[PDB]
Design a protein around this ligand. Structure first.
Ligand SMILES: [Ca+2]
Ligand SMILES: [Ca+2]
Ligand SMILES: [Ca+2]
Ligand SMILES: [Ca+2]
Ligand SMILES: [Zn+2]
Lengths: 523, 723, 523
């Protein structure tokens, strides 16, 4: 008959030469790739390995990926046989409330983000430092003890759902001062955590640490020095392990998809991490997304039998790049707008492949660069400046000034203007000052933490408020000849403490001039 | 269930090897594993047209036999329509008078589908361009396949098998388009052969274009062996080696011949012509005076040749009692032909429709011929045998015998009449003696039907010296395929048949008889066991006579209201009626000589009503002098049946017909001179002609009887009032 | 009908006569060794034993090792049939605090894996002694009892992963005083500890003895005599046992690798340790790296059916030595720069195999020396001195001068130069004196615990800091006639305590100058 080495349901010559699934009169048909038909329909040329039951070493087979007999929550770019399906869970903290262990309490709203430094995941919470001394409000001695409380949400960014189990999360202050350990209550909640969703999702109540219902869980407490350092840095750090529980699999006799107890995630993740090539990308809305594409490991005979994966085809099958008229690009955004950061060993390998091909521009030879397994590639955006965790905290002044070109409704109540959703992220505040014709400048919010004057409106734009720190009064324009400068600051320039000299004033803060208009009918 | 070490054994069966033969032995065995899938027939034909199979290494433009190719021919498009170069590609085929197959050898032909697929594509391109273009193929059969592909609902076959030029062609495919674009048809046939051979893509070619799958499957089963033998027919030495083997095998029966056997064979060849002095001296009486004064060119019972023979007999020396002497002297001048007697009787050589000792001499000579034909064909010097025959269409039918060939050019076949021919020509019964050929000889001008008989292991035959063979009597033939060929720019008909015993064919005809009886008792409301339709069929065009009965009876049903049908068929069931749809001669179905008075008073025409036993005959091949088709013949005879039933509803102890009454003879002399010439002979034929034309398919022929004979219209519509 | 005695899946004539694994048209393909074809491709000639299911007696078969059907975490030099795959785990102690059951001492410890003159993996913790009396600083009388607290990280260096079970480590002070016993928290952690990785990894929090959230851990305490001995020695010792949990196996039905409950590491380690020859080596990064190579045992009739293993081929398959142009070397470093150490039985055996071959020099006869089972070989770098633990603890004066000899900066403020990462493991600090021409020397930081002026730099080139311990002020010579002398101190000469006379001076420190200049413009 027809040889089938791996018993996955697809013969060998189809798996080395290209196969695709066609439907004619409502019946699934598995065909050899015949290119004069199958480009007109829009079907896709799959390739896989003849001697692996799953090519990317994930729990779903080759046949069950190409035909749709798979768990329905799996993301659509994980349907390809060469892209691995595995969950990636980090923890999203929304607000924190600090209190004294018996007003004297603090309630702030935090903004967390997922990090990647220079396999395990984590997240970094940046507590908002503006208005609404922490020891003065709380009334703490040296013999004090503090109580910490917050609201968290588990978020999935991977490509596979997690059934009934949540990970075990450690809470880290500074570098390695563990304040607490968060576990999932009752150990089995009958929930689901789909890819790109939350738990509990955005229209329910968040999980509270030590909630109003239960009491017997461990109270989270600090001493005085931990509270000093937390007032210094405004920054906690979550760390999450990788216990994800059992796997949902398919059954052929009735089409049911059920949680099979004889199959676990914690014994199949260290195969995906050993036989794939990881590409991280943040061109979507400046949040880091991680994918893994199966690639050829040359020194292993069952790993050289995978298909050959150029970097162009890896970007196409992973992130939805496409080339409309030759230039490979991502929803208009061309790839000359994107960097390439490598780690050490794959930088050595890419440099040897470029020296072999006698080319020096990597952006022109992407269809010839081969990927091997165990790589690490980071593709960032050129416009912004990134800190130690590959988070956009800075920009160049050109795009920051060009974000504020398009004006809508200017007055003396404030500014309402159309601003881009990518450039809102890097900006931390605004400074607003009044300049005479003679050369005196009077900043009207003379503190480091009265800069939160912009506010988003649910139609999709932001409205700057001038009244907000001027005793809810409109802008006093005595002589409308002289003007008011209102302009911005970036997160890499923002101060998060009083100074070592105690300076609360707005001096020393770097700044980008975005706005100066006359004061009459133009503004 | 399979445990895990059994999976270790299966995966080591696929993985581990023990012997490695180097490179070149595996290179050699990969090429033979490539060519093992092709049928051996196209390899043998590529051997016979002068072709060389060169399995080479390295470059294929570096071989000697492809050295003089130009720069232009080194741009090759593969199976998918995409570009290639011959120093990059691996198989090329050289066109012309000395073809060459060049294949680069590698170990990639054993598991891959692509390279083997392109090799079978080049072999199919050789088959479409070189071998089949020597017998003028592909042709109308494959054009019907192409028009079935491009007139489908779904557009996947057009994408799979056609180029861009064949897509944008707005009309359908005519044979002009096969003339001036034959290379495109060759490409399409090559691509279909490529997808059929390589066994991974066979289900794909079945799914995306099923009609090409059916064509190529039936092709590679039968037509490839038939085409190899017809290609050997074009060569002379194959013909004479087949001649040599047949002469050596049939030598001893020709050695066991006597003088009487050779005389019987030569009298079976030609008819024994009558001499004229033996005719004239036979009379010598008043009979000579009746032959001497006679209207030669007036009586319509004898043919043209027969009236000319009587004109020849006047110089060797009237619709009244002299023409009975013409009826008696019709059978007196017919030649002693065994083939005409076997052709007219249909197996009953005891039918007393001719003279006495002539019947006995016929029967004894037929028993002598059948006793001499005793040798079987089963032998070891040969494989399958392909024996031919050129035959006239008029020996099967006279309805299609005139309009088969187109009138603008007489070397075409009219396709509408060809599809009417093709529709129901499923089998054949050979009662008479098929004098068949060993090899091909070109046909006479009246014979476009080109038979090709495949024999049985039990075929009984005898040998002739002049290049012919004779088959015995009562042989069954089941038709395989009927197609239009072209040979020397003259379009023909090729027909195959396969020898079966007679019991299977008569079993089929018995089943069809029981089915038509059940259906037409169910449609008329009659007793369960009544036999109202019967078939005495023994000739070559049997299947279409079996199938055409349905159209004949439905057209008779639609042309008359149901009440007259029910009443007159009830009368016929009471009077032991039949509707004999037969293709043998009218005096030999034994519903007609069991009531006539004289042998020479027998009738042979289109339809016939036997008045005593109330039967309606019909004849298969013969066509009426008046009629346009057989359905008007059946209405024409139902006219005489209505005449008889109206003759019974005047007095149940008196005359048989209503037209023999003198109350219709006046209307026959008044309005019997405005209609067609067939009914003008006497009153009954005008009666049947009026009843035929009043119920026509189109209403204007019904309106001609309205305008020409209105009182006869009112009288016939009073003759339906007898209910 | 095919001879197969060991049921591993490879026939017998292939295993005695040579075989190799080739991939051809993306399919695995095992075949006999034919030299004129397979020498050109760069494939490896494998041999094995026809009557053992695994040649090195580790739980991976010969077929599963050569073809890749294995747990992918197994190191690349253990895919050969002759190299044994098994974990080697020791404990890495980062930092210690001593508290009294501020007034608590905090130091940063630097531990190392030791091998004294097979069972268990011991490591020796060296406590830092520089500036932050310990009895005064903790305030301890005679009837005290101290408390110990530290942070550890389990670290694997073997060739095979450990699933879910960490070993049980004893903590020994001095020669044989047990302080405490470290056991695994929660009895299952659901982790993986691969080859060459740390648990917890380098970007999480270490495992703390007597943790903050745990309370049921027994306090690790000392009495007064042990506390004085810990202060006077500056040393601990960690003795780790060999309970290693279960083994991950390969399922031939669907490509799945899972932890098998019926197979155990505790029943296959004492066969690896009884049929194989051990070769310990430290040329890569001066850590003791242990490997085991399968070899014959002549008095056992199922052990003489192993392949014949030379010493050249043993080095090539275990450690990645290669001979590019006839000289066997280790990434440029030649093997005339390495010494060979033996124990007594294999020393007698090698002396007999040398007296057989009429050879005297071992370095020219390495392809003629045959190994047998239960040998023990230690290959050390020639340039360094070693202590009893075989840790690199010294070098000669010449290589230190010639390694520091390419000086970048030399002035009155410090000294910056490029220093190699092998020489940075044997130096405990730097001091600078001024020697008068009549004979008066002037040490500027005249204590045993102000040596740590050197700091690792982001440039990678360390700067010897003259500022930090001179009351943060640089050096002013009065006459450039007499010289300025700076000198490194090497770890076998570094003193860790005052003497019996309470001396804190510089005499007794045997000098190795890295600096010899007359003080003036030359340096
Ligand atoms: Ca497969
Ligand atoms: Ca597969
Ligand atoms: Ca074996
Ligand atoms: Ca073996
Ligand atoms: Zn007539």
């Amino acid at each position: 008959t027809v040889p089938d080495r791996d018993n996955d349901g697809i013969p060998d010559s189809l798996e080395v030469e290209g196969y695709t699934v066609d439907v004619k009169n409502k019946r699934t048909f598995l065909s050899p790739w015949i290119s004069n038909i199958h480009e007109k329909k829009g079907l896709t040329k799959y390739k896989s390995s003849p001697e692996k039951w799953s090519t990317a070493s994930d729990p779903y087979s080759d046949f069950e990926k190409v035909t749709g007999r798979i768990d329905g929550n799996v993301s659509p770019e994980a349907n390809h046989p060469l892209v691995a399906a595995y969950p990636i869970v980090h923890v999203d903290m929304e607000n924190i409330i600090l209190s004294k262990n018996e007003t004297r309490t603090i309630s702030k709203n935090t903004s967390t983000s997922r990090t990647h430094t220079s396999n395990s995941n984590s997240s970094t919470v940046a507590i908002d430092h503006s208005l609404s001394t922490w020891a003065e409000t709380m009334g703490l001695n040296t013999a004090d003890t503090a109580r910490l409380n917050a609201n968290i949400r588990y978020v999935n960014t991977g490509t596979a759902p997690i059934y009934n189990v949540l990970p075990t999360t450690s809470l880290v202050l500074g570098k390695n001062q563990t304040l607490a350990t968060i576990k999932a209550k009752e150990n089995q909640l009958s929930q689901i955590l789909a890819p790109n969703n939350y738990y509990p999702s955005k229209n329910l109540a968040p999980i509270a640490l030590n909630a109003q219902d239960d009491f017997s869980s461990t109270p989270i407490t600090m001493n005085y020095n931990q509270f000093l350092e937390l007032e210094k840095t405004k920054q906690l750090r979550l760390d999450t392990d990788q216990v994800y529980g059992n796997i949902a699999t398919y059954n052929f006799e009735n089409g049911r998809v059920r949680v099979d107890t004889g199959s676990n995630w914690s014994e199949v993740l260290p195969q995906i991490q050993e036989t794939t090539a990881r590409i991280i990308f943040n061109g979507k809305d400046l949040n880091l997304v991680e994918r893994r594409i199966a690639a050829v490991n040359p020194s292993d005979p069952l790993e050289t039998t995978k298909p050959d994966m150029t970097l162009k085809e890896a970007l196409k099958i992973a992130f939805g790049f496409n080339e409309p008229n030759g230039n490979l690009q991502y929803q208009g955004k061309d790839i000359t707008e994107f960097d390439f950061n490598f780690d050490q060993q794959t930088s050595q390998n890419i440099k040897n492949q470029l020296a072999e091909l006698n080319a020096t521009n990597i952006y022109t030879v992407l269809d010839k660069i081969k990927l091997n397994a165990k790589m690490n590639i980071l593709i960032r955006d050129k416009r912004f400046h990134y800190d130690r965790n590959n988070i956009a905290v800075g920009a160049d002044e050109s795009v920051v000034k060009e974000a504020h070109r398009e004006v809508i409704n200017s007055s003396t109540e404030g500014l309402l203007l159309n601003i881009d959703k990518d450039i809102r992220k890097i900006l931390s505040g605004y400074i607003v000052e009044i300049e005479d014709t003679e050369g005196l400048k009077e900043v009207i919010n003379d503190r480091y933490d009265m800069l939160n004057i912009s506010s988003l409106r649910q139609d999709g734009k932001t409205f700057i408020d001038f009244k907000k720190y001027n005793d809810k009064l409109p802008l006093y324009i005595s002589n409308p000849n002289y003007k008011v400068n209102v302009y911005a600051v970036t997160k890499e320039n923002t101060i998060i403490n009083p100074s070592e000299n105690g300076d609360t004033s707005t001096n020393g803060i770097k700044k980008i001039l975005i706005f100066s208009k006359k004061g009459y009918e133009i503004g | 269930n399979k445990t895990q070490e059994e999976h270790l054994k299966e995966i080591m069966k696929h993985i581990v090897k023990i012997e490695v033969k180097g490179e070149e032995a595996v290179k050699k065995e990969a090429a033979e594993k490539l060519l093992e899938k092709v049928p051996s027939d196209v390899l043998e034909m590529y051997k016979a047209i002068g072709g060389k199979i060169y399995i080479v290494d390295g470059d294929i433009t570096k071989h000697i036999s492809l050295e003089a190719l130009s720069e232009d021919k080194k741009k090759i498009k593969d199976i998918y329509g995409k570009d290639a170069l011959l120093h990059e590609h691996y198989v090329y085929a050289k066109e012309g008078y000395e073809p060459v197959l060049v294949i680069q050898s590698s170990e990639d032909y054993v598991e891959n589908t692509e390279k083997a697929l392109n090799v079978y594509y080049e072999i199919g391109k050789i088959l479409s361009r070189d071998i089949l273009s020597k017998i003028n193929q592909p042709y109308q059969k494959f054009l019907d396949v192409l028009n079935t592909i491009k007139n489908a609902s779904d557009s996947d076959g057009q994408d799979l098998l056609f180029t861009n030029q064949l897509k944008e062609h707005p009309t359908d495919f005519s044979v002009e388009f096969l003339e001036q674009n034959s290379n495109e048809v060759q490409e399409v046939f090559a691509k279909a052969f490529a997808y059929y051979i390589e066994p991974q893509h066979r289900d794909v070619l079945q799914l995306y274009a099923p009609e090409a799958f059916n064509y190529m499957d039936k092709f590679n089963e039968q037509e490839i062996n038939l085409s190899l033998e017809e290609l050997k027919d074009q060569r002379m030495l194959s013909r004479y080696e087949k001649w040599e083997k047949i002469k050596q095998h049939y030598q001893h029966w020709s050695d066991s011949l006597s003088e009487e056997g050779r005389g019987l064979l030569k009298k079976l060849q030609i008819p024994i012509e009558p001499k004229k002095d033996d005719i004239i001296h036979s009379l010598s009486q008043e009979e000579k005076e009746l032959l001497k004064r006679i209207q030669i060119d007036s009586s319509d019972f004898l043919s043209t040749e027969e009236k000319e023979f009587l004109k020849k007999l006047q110089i060797d020396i009237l619709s009244e009692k002299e023409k009975e002497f013409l009826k008696k002297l019709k059978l007196d001048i017919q030649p002693y032909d065994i083939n005409q007697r076997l052709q007219d009787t249909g197996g009953l050589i005891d039918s007393p429709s001719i003279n006495l000792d002539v019947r006995k001499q016929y029967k004894r000579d037929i028993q002598n011929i059948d006793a001499l034909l005793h040798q079987s064909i089963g032998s070891t010097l040969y494989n399958k045998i392909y024996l031919y025959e050129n035959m006239n269409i008029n020996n099967l039918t006279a309805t299609l015998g005139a309009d088969l060939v187109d009138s603008t050019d007489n070397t075409k076949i009219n396709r509408g009449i060809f599809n009417e021919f093709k529709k129901n020509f499923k089998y054949s019964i050979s009662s008479n003696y098929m004098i068949v050929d060993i090899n091909e000889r070109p046909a006479l001008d009246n014979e476009r039907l080109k038979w090709r008989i495949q024999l049985s292991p039990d075929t009984r035959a005898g040998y002739l010296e002049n290049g012919k063979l004779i088959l015995q009597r009562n042989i069954g033939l089941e038709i395989k395929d009927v197609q239009i060929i072209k040979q020397s720019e003259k379009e023909y008909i090729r027909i195959d048949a396969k020898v079966v015993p007679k019991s299977k064919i008569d079993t089929k005809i018995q089943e069809a008889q029981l089915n038509i009886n059940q259906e037409w008792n169910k449609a008329l409301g009659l007793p369960k066991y009544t036999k109202l339709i019967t078939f005495n069929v023994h000739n070559r065009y049997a299947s279409n006579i079996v199938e055409s009965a349905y159209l004949i009876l439905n057209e008779w049903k639609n042309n008359i209201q149901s009440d007259l049908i029910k009443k007159v068929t009830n009368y016929l069931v009471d009077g032991n009626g039949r509707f004999v749809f037969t293709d043998i001669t009218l005096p030999n179905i034994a519903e007609q000589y069991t009531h006539q008075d004289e042998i020479y008073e027998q009738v042979h025409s289109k339809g016939l009503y036997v008045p005593e036993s109330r039967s309606i005959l019909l004849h298969g091949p013969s066509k009426g002098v008046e009629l346009r088709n057989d359905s008007e013949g059946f209405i024409h005879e139902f006219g005489h049946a209505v005449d008889d039933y109206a003759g019974y509803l005047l007095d149940k102890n008196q005359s048989d017909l209503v037209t023999n009454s003198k109350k219709f003879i006046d209307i026959f002399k008044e309005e019997g001179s405005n209609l067609t010439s067939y009914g003008r002979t006497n009153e009954a034929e005008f009666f049947a002609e009026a009843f035929r034309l009043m119920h026509s398919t189109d209403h204007a022929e019904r309106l001609k009887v309205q305008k020409n004979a209105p009182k006869t219209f009112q009288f016939i519509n009073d003759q339906i009032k007898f209910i």
